[PDB]
Amino acid sequence: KLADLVMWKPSFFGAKPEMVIKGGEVAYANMGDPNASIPTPEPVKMRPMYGALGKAGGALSIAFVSKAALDQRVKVLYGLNKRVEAVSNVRKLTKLDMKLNDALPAITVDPDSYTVTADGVVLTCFVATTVPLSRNYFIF
Amino acid sequence: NKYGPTTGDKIRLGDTALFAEIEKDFAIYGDECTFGGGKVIRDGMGQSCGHPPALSLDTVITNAVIIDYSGIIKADIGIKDGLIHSIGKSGNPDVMDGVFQNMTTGVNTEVIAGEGLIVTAGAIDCHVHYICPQLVYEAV
Amino acid sequence: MKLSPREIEKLGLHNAGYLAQKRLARGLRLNYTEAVALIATQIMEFVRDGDKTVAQLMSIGRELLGRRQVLPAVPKLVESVQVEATFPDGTELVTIHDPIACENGNLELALLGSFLPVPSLDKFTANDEIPGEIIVVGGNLVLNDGRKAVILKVVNNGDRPVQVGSHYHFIELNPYLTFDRRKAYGMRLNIAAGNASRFEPGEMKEVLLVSIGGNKVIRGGNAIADGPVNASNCIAAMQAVITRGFGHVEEANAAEGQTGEDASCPFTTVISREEYANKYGPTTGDKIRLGDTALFAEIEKDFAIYGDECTFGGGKVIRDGMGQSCGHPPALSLDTVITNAVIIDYSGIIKADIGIKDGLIHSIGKSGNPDVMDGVFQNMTTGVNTEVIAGEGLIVTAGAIDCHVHYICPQLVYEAVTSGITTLVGGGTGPTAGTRATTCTPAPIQMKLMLQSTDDLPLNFGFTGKGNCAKPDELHEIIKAGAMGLKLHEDWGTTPAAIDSCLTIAEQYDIQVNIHTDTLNESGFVEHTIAAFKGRTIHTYHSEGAGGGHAPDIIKVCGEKNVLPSSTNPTRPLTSNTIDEHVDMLMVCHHLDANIAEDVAFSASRIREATIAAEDILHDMGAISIISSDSQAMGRIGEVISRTWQTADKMKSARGPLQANDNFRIKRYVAKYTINPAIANGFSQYVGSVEVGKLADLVMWKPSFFGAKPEMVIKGGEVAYANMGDPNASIPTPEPVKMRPMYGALGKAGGALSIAFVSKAALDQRVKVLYGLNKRVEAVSNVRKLTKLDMKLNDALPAITVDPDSYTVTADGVVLTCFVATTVPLSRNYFIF
Amino acid sequence: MKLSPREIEKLGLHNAGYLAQKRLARGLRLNYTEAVALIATQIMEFVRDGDKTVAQLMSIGRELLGRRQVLPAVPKLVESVQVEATFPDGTELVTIHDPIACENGNLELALLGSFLPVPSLDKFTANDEIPGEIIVVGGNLVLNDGRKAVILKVVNNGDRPVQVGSHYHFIELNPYLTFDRRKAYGMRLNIAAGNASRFEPGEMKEVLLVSIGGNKVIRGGNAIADGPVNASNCIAAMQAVITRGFGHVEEANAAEGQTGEDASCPFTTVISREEYANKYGPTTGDKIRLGDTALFAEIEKDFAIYGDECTFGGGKVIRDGMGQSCGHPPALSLDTVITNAVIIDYSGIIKADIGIKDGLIHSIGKSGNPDVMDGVFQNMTTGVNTEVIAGEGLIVTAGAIDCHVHYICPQLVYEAVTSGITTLVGGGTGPTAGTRATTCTPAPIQMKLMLQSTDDLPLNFGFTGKGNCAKPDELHEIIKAGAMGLKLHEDWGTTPAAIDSCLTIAEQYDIQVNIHTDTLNESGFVEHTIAAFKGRTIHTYHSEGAGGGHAPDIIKVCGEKNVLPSSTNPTRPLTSNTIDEHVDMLMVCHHLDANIAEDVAFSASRIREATIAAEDILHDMGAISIISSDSQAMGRIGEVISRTWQTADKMKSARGPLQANDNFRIKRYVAKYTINPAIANGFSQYVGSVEVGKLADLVMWKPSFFGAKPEMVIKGGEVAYANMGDPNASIPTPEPVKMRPMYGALGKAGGALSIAFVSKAALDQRVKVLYGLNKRVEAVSNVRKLTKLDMKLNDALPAITVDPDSYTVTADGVVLTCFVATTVPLSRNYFIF
Numbered sequence A: 001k002l003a004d005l006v007m008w009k010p011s012f013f014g015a016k017p018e019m020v021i022k023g024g025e026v027a028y029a030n031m032g033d034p035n036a037s038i039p040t041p042e043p044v045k046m047r048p049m050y051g052a053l054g055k056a057g058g059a060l061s062i063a064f065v066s067k068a069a070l071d072q073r074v075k076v077l078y079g080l081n082k083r084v085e086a087v088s089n090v091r092k093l094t095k096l097d098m099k100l101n102d103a104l105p106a107i108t109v110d111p112d113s114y115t116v117t118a119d120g121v122v123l124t125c126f127v128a129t130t131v132p133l134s135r136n137y138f139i140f
Numbered sequence B: 001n002k003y004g005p006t007t008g009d010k011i012r013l014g015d016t017a018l019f020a021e022i023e024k025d026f027a028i029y030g031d032e033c034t035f036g037g038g039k040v041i042r043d044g045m046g047q048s049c050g051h052p053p054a055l056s057l058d059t060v061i062t063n064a065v066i067i068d069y070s071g072i073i074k075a076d077i078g079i080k081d082g083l084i085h086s087i088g089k090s091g092n093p094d095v096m097d098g099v100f101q102n103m104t105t106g107v108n109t110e111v112i113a114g115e116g117l118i119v120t121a122g123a124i125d126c127h128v129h130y131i132c133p134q135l136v137y138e139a140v
Numbered sequence C, D: 001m002k003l004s005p006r007e008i009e010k011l012g013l014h015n016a017g018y019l020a021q022k023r024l025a026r027g028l029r030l031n032y033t034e035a036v037a038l039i040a041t042q043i044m045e046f047v048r049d050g051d052k053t054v055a056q057l058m059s060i061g062r063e064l065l066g067r068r069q070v071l072p073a074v075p076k077l078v079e080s081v082q083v084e085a086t087f088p089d090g091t092e093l094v095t096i097h098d099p100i101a102c103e104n105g106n107l108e109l110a111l112l113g114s115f116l117p118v119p120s121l122d123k124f125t126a127n128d129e130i131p132g133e134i135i136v137v138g139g140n141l142v143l144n145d146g147r148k149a150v151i152l153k154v155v156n157n158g159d160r161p162v163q164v165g166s167h168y169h170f171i172e173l174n175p176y177l178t179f180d181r182r183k184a185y186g187m188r189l190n191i192a193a194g195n196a197s198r199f200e201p202g203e204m205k206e207v208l209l210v211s212i213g214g215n216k217v218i219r220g221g222n223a224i225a226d227g228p229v230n231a232s233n234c235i236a237a238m239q240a241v242i243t244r245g246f247g248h249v250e251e252a253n254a255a256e257g258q259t260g261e262d263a264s265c266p267f268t269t270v271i272s273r274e275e276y277a278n279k280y281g282p283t284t285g286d287k288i289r290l291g292d293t294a295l296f297a298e299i300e301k302d303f304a305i306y307g308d309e310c311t312f313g314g315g316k317v318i319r320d321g322m323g324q325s326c327g328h329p330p331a332l333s334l335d336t337v338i339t340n341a342v343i344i345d346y347s348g349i350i351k352a353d354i355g356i357k358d359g360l361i362h363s364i365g366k367s368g369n370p371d372v373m374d375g376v377f378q379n380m381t382t383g384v385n386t387e388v389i390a391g392e393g394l395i396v397t398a399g400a401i402d403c404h405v406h407y408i409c410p411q412l413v414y415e416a417v418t419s420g421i422t423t424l425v426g427g428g429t430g431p432t433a434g435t436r437a438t439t440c441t442p443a444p445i446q447m448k449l450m451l452q453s454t455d456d457l458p459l460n461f462g463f464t465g466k467g468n469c470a471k472p473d474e475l476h477e478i479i480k481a482g483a484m485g486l487k488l489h490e491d492w493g494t495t496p497a498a499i500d501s502c503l504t505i506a507e508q509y510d511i512q513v514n515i516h517t518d519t520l521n522e523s524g525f526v527e528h529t530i531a532a533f534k535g536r537t538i539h540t541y542h543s544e545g546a547g548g549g550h551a552p553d554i555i556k557v558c559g560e561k562n563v564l565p566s567s568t569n570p571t572r573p574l575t576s577n578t579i580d581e582h583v584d585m586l587m588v589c590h591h592l593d594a595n596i597a598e599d600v601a602f603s604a605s606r607i608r609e610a611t612i613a614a615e616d617i618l619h620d621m622g623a624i625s626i627i628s629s630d631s632q633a634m635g636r637i638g639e640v641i642s643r644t645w646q647t648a649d650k651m652k653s654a655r656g657p658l659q660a661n662d663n664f665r666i667k668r669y670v671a672k673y674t675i676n677p678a679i680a681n682g683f684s685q686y687v688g689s690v691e692v693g694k695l696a697d698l699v700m701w702k703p704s705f706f707g708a709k710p711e712m713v714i715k716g717g718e719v720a721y722a723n724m725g726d727p728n729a730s731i732p733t734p735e736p737v738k739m740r741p742m743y744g745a746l747g748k749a750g751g752a753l754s755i756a757f758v759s760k761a762a763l764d765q766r767v768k769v770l771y772g773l774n775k776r777v778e779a780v781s782n783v784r785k786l787t788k789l790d791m792k793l794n795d796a797l798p799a800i801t802v803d804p805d806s807y808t809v810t811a812d813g814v815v816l817t818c819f820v821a822t823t824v825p826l827s828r829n830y831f832i833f
């Protein structure tokens, strides 16, 4: 498969990644002072990298079209430098084809209370007052 | 601390309460691929010299914790032609046991240091409204 | 001279007439091609003379060549000869219909102007006792069953002739036809699809009318009845007939019924069965002789619903609102439809319309307009934007696939498409010593170059690198460059080490390994090479071995489950000149001396009647799966097809039937140059058979010429190459007719219509982008898990032994012996040299 | 007729046979080409007849034309005639070996079917008493000197024949050969490079074995001995011989020594010297006749190490692990190797392998595999990915460079590459009055167009603008547009003012000025034009003047140190029809009247036996440096080469030797159409000689045909054009063989292989990008500091005078007179018209 790959610090996992590899080449990443003696001095922010300049973005990625469009070579017609591929194998999917998420409860919903029942069990959940991956990470 | 966690170790995801346990490690203790002055990935040592040039990895990501739907593991990741070429123990078959012919770090191989980091697939957002190009930068 | 192109061509046409003249003066009975050149030539000279008129030459042309002067097939092959020439009053077209109109012709007049002595009759051989003949089942067919019907009186009250086509909406006729318009509503003539009833002025006719089918929606004509047929639209149509003055007299008494399937119902129309075959080509149960061989294809299935055939022409079925649909969504109109085709293909011999869309085969079945015809599915619509290729009477097969090609010269290529080949797989870089010996494009640089070189040519191409190596290093590189397969050849060394190293690579890259084994047994005998395979898929070239390999027993490979075996074509089949030809050919290619003991020993160990005899059989057995050329390196590019059928004709005649027709054999063989070369090389999803979803690489044949010269080659949906006559002429059929590139072969079109095949690794790097290729590029795949059992209809696995002294071949205990045929079909009847 | 391409070609082949038939009936002795057409033609007719077999025609073909019916060269030129035709049993190949197998042939049978009266013998001229003959030095050569050796008993204990090639690693043989495997280690057969020893089953042979060379690393075969030869790998090889059952009996007593350079040492193998030349082409000391001229090239130097020649073929040297290397870094494999070439080039007549890489000449020397052969440098490796062009027996020269081209029609171009020309320099825009008179592409627009036009053609091109101007304004513009040189022509005015203004521009832009002076002396006599040069470099076209310039003394320019002078080719050399032809040609081009006093006066002042006689000499003197065509504007594109050698042949015969061979003359002349046109136009770093670093624009010749018709034209590393026979045939040699474009001439390839030359100023602006050119574009340079002394081997500077009345030319005090030759070589023997 494409080496579309994201590097994370565990201390920052799920909030802000270090580096985004697109098709095997670094496309976007944390980067500090361009004039500095190393890459880590302030201000460090997410910036596009060599994978995002000139013709590179196209060489590293896929535009997805229908098979019919590809049969006509819309990649050629449209003058695209990005690789074009067709989507497929979508008309025979069921919920059971979703990796680790194939559950199929009997669901009822009360038209007045809006209460949801799944497999006989009334679903109720508390209202969390906070979430992780937020106050520790963001300047706004 | 040097090479990232190994089989049995657990890793807190960000500041959540989630722990990921290393399920499997491909490392053979003592031959980890680490790059730097005096380090392992040098000519004729960890960097192979004399294998067929066409099979050198374009890039190796070293000592990655991979979190993926298919497993949470510790592995080197080799990239070739924009694709994921292999996942396992990489390095130099002339000097190290357990290096298969699809995981050679060679002269012409770039190094992305994964030690201590998590790698996951790039995320795929399948409910996008192309309202402005800046959504895109915010996404990547 | 200021010669225009037409003048130059006719000079060639003349030279052919004169050659045919010389042959006739020798008392040779002329073939088809000779008869044509001769007659067109004389017609042009008579025109030069200025004495004779068009009408004269039309008669004179029939009295030049007589039955005595021609071969037995000719009177059925030569339906007529056409040419155009400059008469005193400018260019005029002369058609000579049925030129063999007599027994003796007129020799003097057939030679007149040639200054060749006129031979006497007794110099000619005595007459012997029909290629592509249709054997019709006896009987009739009721058209248009199961439909509401009516017979109505119709009068032409106009002063000029009116003629109505089989599918025209009858209510929509010329307002000067008087009849019961209300009864005519929703009806059309119940006559054969594509003909007409003519009304001279004042004429009265009693016409059988039958209801339209499908959705029953009327469109076009005069817009009298626009809409779906129902009581509410009838009322509106009658209003418009009154308002607009369309001729109408109520026929209260008209006979009404329907088209019942019984005898003597006055509403039905039957078509004589022989006549049906002649109009629309054969249907279920009829049989067709392949060319002038002894082979007969029986139509196994027909999609037609009798009476609604898709025939295009003046008055015919494919017209706005009738068979051509009007109102369906425009995106689903077929780009092209091939009407009334006999399809011969490994998967079945059938009768069907073929729909092309986006360069692909979109559908196979009953095509037309769902508004007016029953049985038309949504993927078979003939629409406004649909081109028609008329296959009635013709056979359609997939484009042949030649998978043993040496790229020695560009002309091999034109010779290939012109014979019916649309894919080439092999190696080479031009007329070098390496390419003349091996199918190898050795350098990455040369891969780039050959892909760039062939980029405008309307054929799919695959190039193979040099597989001969005891290390994988450079093999990696040639595949990354774009090779889609590797060739192991003895001339570069085919040793067990090279064989292993090469196949280990093939396992990595999913490409096919083709091999020409070590003839010298320098390194091992055949056993040792088979061991070196190690159970891995490998394509063995010319498995019989005349073309190369372990002496004398390479043929043993046709019994290894992991071997896919092919033959090259020159040893096909064993005929009387075969052995003599091949020994010398071997001597010439190997620079050997007839007078040196061991040179003659090597040669006799290579070229073997016993093994070539065995090849005819294993070919018929389905033990050798593919036939290929070896173009210009022991084999012949334009004869992959003819040699396949020649082999099949000889076995029919020598052996038992294979399963009252020749279907099983026909299918078994067609698969040898269509589907099996594509499976073995790994691109069978794209080409190799007439099946939905694949490229529309399709070849149109006249049954009389089938397996010798095709009419037309369609590359990815568009005609690429075809028979074409005088470009100045009023029609395309006048002489000289020859195979010419068409619009699919010019400018950018060849690239738009075809595929270049590479390895997945090369496509991973986008060599299509790197090489600046305009041809579509795709990867070969699914080749490292093939066994002989994956070869369609050619999956036999005999236990083979070969006697090291007598060279006798034994398969499953049976000693293989076959006769030396003295002649073959698909030759003397067809070729000028 | 449904003619396939092969049918159309054979019709042409026939027409050639019949023409040759007509000539024979007149009692003309046939040349090579006639003999071939005639015989192939009859063979095809005999096949049409259906009476005769392949084996018959093989004998019959030898008895058609006899020594009496052919010219003196023919029995050596016609080694054989091949054709394929449709016998009753399909297409078969007929080879006629040594067709002149007798004295009288069989006239009746050579004409049979032609209805031509059969001439009697006495109608034919009487026999006269060998083109490209190799004159061998007397003697033998010891192969493989200085190497460890052993003689061993070898037995074939297998039941099938085993044959071993000269370079196969002996320990790696078929396990059914029994011998002392431990002694065989590191050894190979000591026989001529490329042959073999054959073991029938049960046979015992006593084989001479010699040690491998270079690094002594074994690869391939069975992998018995994988590795460098040393005591440690020997032990492992013996282990594997035991384990794997490879036949082994110790021969404790075997004779051991080495290959000493003395007489009667039983370990050495000698090759007869005449036989060496025949296998591998000539070596140091041998001599080669150029075509049918009187010229002899002696091999000055050979890089071969006798015994290790690179020969490719079954059993031959170029195979995996033997001569083909296995394990070197893949990037340094040669793309192509030309094996065993005689190179004739200004810089030396030598014997060498030629290595091609990236379209460039990479190396010249001894090529092969450093693991098994001595003397192979790192830039000469034949690898897995290396294509082979076999030059053994052949001559290689640089592509000719024609620097006086008028682009009148595209066909000039094909005629040029087919004769051995790969670069064209001139001007024009097609068949207009301006281009028919001058080598001028006048408008910037037309520059763009001609560069775009010629973009796919596999030749390097340079275009020149109109230099005729008394102001620089528009000259700036044409050079900026892409002109790489300017032409001053009298037809546009070549006045001293125009000459000055044009050369001042040339000094600015570093481009060459070509001039055709003022014939009319309208403005000045030659003195005045020379003064206008002002010591600046200028190329004078057809310096003799028949083709144009100051009457009667333009030739004086061959004595000016700043003049680079060329001749055009039609006046080369002075022969009996020369003067008559040229006067009329002049009359025709100038629209003059034979009956008007001054028209005939101008003409006699232009065309001059005295000056043309002087041109033969100054040409031989090295006083005129270049020979060019003047294609279709007084000169002949396909004859730049032949006319150069024709001139050299006539001078050999008329004058003294130039420095026991013709090397000095040969080199002097070859430089006239190779290196000197590239120096004068400013692109000699890219083309013009067979030297490392330049494009691999290389022409392969048969010595028998050298300077008449080449075999093959390699453009930038890839075959572009070559002799090719029947595209349908089993080999590339059957008739009709004709010069055809190859894969380097199709699609995008011509562009990838060639250069378009422009001015530096045009490249500064990237006209390659602006014009959308796929051909590589480069700038010409180093042209404003040239003098006659920069012309390789043609730097002579005579003091010249010309008598204004007698036209007599004097050079350095010597009156120049030369005879009118009645005939020339490289003509009657070669051409069909």
Ligand code: NI
Pocket: C516, C541, C542, C547, C548
């Ligand atoms: Ni072969």
Ligand code: NI
Pocket: C404, C406, C437, C438, C439, C630, C633
């Ligand atoms: Ni072959």
Ligand code: NI
Pocket: D516, D541, D542, D547, D548
């Ligand atoms: Ni001139």
Ligand code: NI
Pocket: D404, D406, D437, D438, D439, D630, D633
């Ligand atoms: Ni000129």
